[PDB]
Design an enzyme around this catalytic site. Structure first.
Site, PDB file in Angstrom:
ATOM      1  CB  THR A 132       1.699  -5.568  -5.406  1.00  0.00           C
ATOM      2  OG1 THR A 132       1.615  -6.557  -4.367  1.00  0.00           O
ATOM      3  CG2 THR A 132       1.659  -6.267  -6.753  1.00  0.00           C
ATOM      4  CB  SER A 133       1.439  -0.902  -2.780  1.00  0.00           C
ATOM      5  OG  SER A 133       2.392  -0.128  -3.483  1.00  0.00           O
ATOM      6  CG  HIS A 151       5.318  -8.610  -0.901  1.00  0.00           C
ATOM      7  ND1 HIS A 151       4.045  -8.997  -1.257  1.00  0.00           N
ATOM      8  CD2 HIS A 151       5.444  -7.320  -1.298  1.00  0.00           C
ATOM      9  CE1 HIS A 151       3.422  -7.982  -1.826  1.00  0.00           C
ATOM     10  NE2 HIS A 151       4.250  -6.954  -1.867  1.00  0.00           N
ATOM     11  N   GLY A 152       6.678 -12.226   1.322  1.00  0.00           N
ATOM     12  CA  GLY A 152       7.556 -13.272   1.821  1.00  0.00           C
ATOM     13  C   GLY A 152       7.572 -14.484   0.919  1.00  0.00           C
ATOM     14  CB  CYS A 203       4.065 -15.502   0.610  1.00  0.00           C
ATOM     15  SG  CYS A 203       3.806 -14.226  -0.631  1.00  0.00           S
TER      16      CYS A 203
END
Lengths: 4, 235, 234, 4
Positions: free
Chosen positions: C28-29, C87-88, C129
Site C-alpha cells: 500500500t501507499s 514497509h518492513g 513494521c
C-alpha cells in the site's frame, strides 16, 4: 578465552 | 516523571540462572568460569539491595516454571525486577540444561498485562549467551504498551558468539559488575551500560592457540524499551 | 566519556522516503510519510547535519545509494545518520519493488569497511513494521567492527509500527519533537527514552476495524554505542 | 491511523  | 520510582520498600528480586552443566541429549560443553559470574552478580546486586536468588543448572521446563512462579508473586512493594541468564544461546534463545527455550516465552510472563504488580516498573533481562556463531575480527583503531518498560542487556551483538574466560568469567558480566560497582551511585543505567559497552569493546581481545578464534572482539547490545531513566540510588 | 562531535561537520543524514510501491508488490501507499520526511529534514538541518532526501527507491537503488555513501570520505564528519521510512518486516526494509536485508545496508558502514567512520557513531533510525503483532496495551584488532552503531527502531520486535496519514508516523513525530526540545540539554539515549515514553503514553490507534482499534506501540532502542552522544559541543 |  572460550565461546559460549 | 522522567525517572522510575525506585524508593519502594524493596528494590526487587534479582533472579540469577546459572547453567553450567548440560545434559548429553543437548550435547553441550560445561561453561567454565560461569560460577565466577554468578558469584560476582550475587555480590554486585546484593550491594544494590536486591533480593538475590541464585539458581543453578535448570532444565528449560524448570526455567519456564520458575519464571511463571516469580511472575505470580506480589511485586507491589518492589521497585523493579532483574533476571540474569547465564547459559549457552542462539539468537532469541537460551538453553536450559536439556535444550533451547525462546526468550520470548520467559519474558512474556512479565508483560504489562500479565504481571500487574510490575506494570510501569522496569523489568531488566541481562543475557550472557551466544546470539549466533559469527566472530568479530575487529579493526585497528490511558493505556501503556504491554511490551513497555523492558530492558534487554545483551552480552553481544545479534548473530555473534559471546566470549567467556574460564578463570575471570565472561567479558560482559565482568565488565557489567565492575561498572555497576563504580557508577551505580553516580550514573543513569543506560550510561552505565554504555561504559560496559566501551569496556568490553576496548579492554578485551581473545587469546587462542587456534588462529581462527584468536584476536577476536565483542560489543554488547543494549535493547531498551524503557520509558524512564533508571537510577539505583536514592534522594 | 563522550563522542567527539566538534569535527568540521556533524555528518550526513540520509533520509530514504518510500511512499509509492510498485503495483506488483501488493504494498500500500504510505500516506503521511512525506510529513515525516520533511519533519526529519528540518530537525536534522537544525542539528547541522547535511541532509539528503531520497524518495521512492527500488531495492537496487537503496543498496547502491548506501554503498556509494559508505565510500565517501567521512574524515571531517563527526557522525553518520540514516533514516529509513518504508514497509518492513523483522530485519528487512522494503524498496519500492521488494525487500532489502537491513544487515546488507548497515554492513557497508562496519568499522572495517568504512574506515573514515571508525570510532564514530552510526545511527540508523527505522520507521517500519517488524512483524504483524498488535499491542493491546494495559490500563495504568583494536575495536569491534560492529561497535558504535545505534538502531532506533520505531516498534518492538515482532510488532506492527503505526503511522497517521495526516500527522506522520507516531515514532518520527515523537523523535523530531524530542530532538527539537532536548537536543541542547540531554544525552541521546535519554532523548530516545523520552521518545519511548511519548509514543507509549500519548498515542493510541483509532480504527473502525475492531482488530486494529485502541492499539499501542513502544519503540526499541538498540545501542552498540561505546560513548555518550551529545548534539551540542564546545 | 494505519499500519506500515
Amino acid at each position: 578465552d572460550e565461546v559460549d | 516523571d522522567n525517572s522510575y520510582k525506585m524508593d519502594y520498600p524493596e528494590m526487587g528480586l534479582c533472579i540469577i540462572i546459572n547453567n553450567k552443566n548440560f545434559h548429553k541429549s543437548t550435547g553441550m560443553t560445561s561453561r567454565s568460569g560461569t560460577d565466577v559470574d554468578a558469584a560476582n552478580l550475587r555480590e554486585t546486586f546484593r550491594n544494590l539491595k536486591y533480593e538475590v536468588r541464585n539458581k543453578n543448572d535448570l532444565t528449560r521446563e524448570e526455567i519456564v516454571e520458575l519464571m511463571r512462579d516469580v511472575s505470580k508473586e506480589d511485586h507491589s512493594k518492589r521497585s523493579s525486577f532483574v533476571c540474569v541468564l547465564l547459559s549457552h544461546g542462539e539468537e532469541g534463545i537460551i538453553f536450559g540444561t536439556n535444550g533451547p527455550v525462546d526468550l520470548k516465552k520467559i519474558t512474556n510472563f512479565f508483560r504489562g498485562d500479565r504481571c500487574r504488580s510490575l506494570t510501569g516498573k522496569p523489568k531488566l533481562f541481562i543475557i550472557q549467551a551466544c546470539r549466533g556463531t559469527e566472530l568479530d575480527c575487529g579493526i585497528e583503531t490511558h493505556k501503556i504498551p504491554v511490551e513497555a518498560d523492558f530492558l534487554y542487556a545483551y552480552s553481544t551483538a545479534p548473530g555473534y558468539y559471546s566470549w567467556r574466560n574460564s578463570k575471570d568469567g565472561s567479558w560482559f558480566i565482568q565488565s557489567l559488575c565492575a561498572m555497576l560497582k563504580q557508577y551505580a551511585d553516580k550514573l543513569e543505567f543506560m550510561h552505565i551500560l554504555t561504559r560496559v559497552n566501551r569496556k568490553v569493546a576496548t579492554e578485551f581481545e581473545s587469546f587462542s592457540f587456534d588462529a581462527t578464534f584468536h584476536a577476536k572482539k565483542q560489543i554488547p547490545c543494549i535493547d531498551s524499551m524503557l520509558t524512564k531513566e533508571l537510577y539505583f540510588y536514592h534522594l
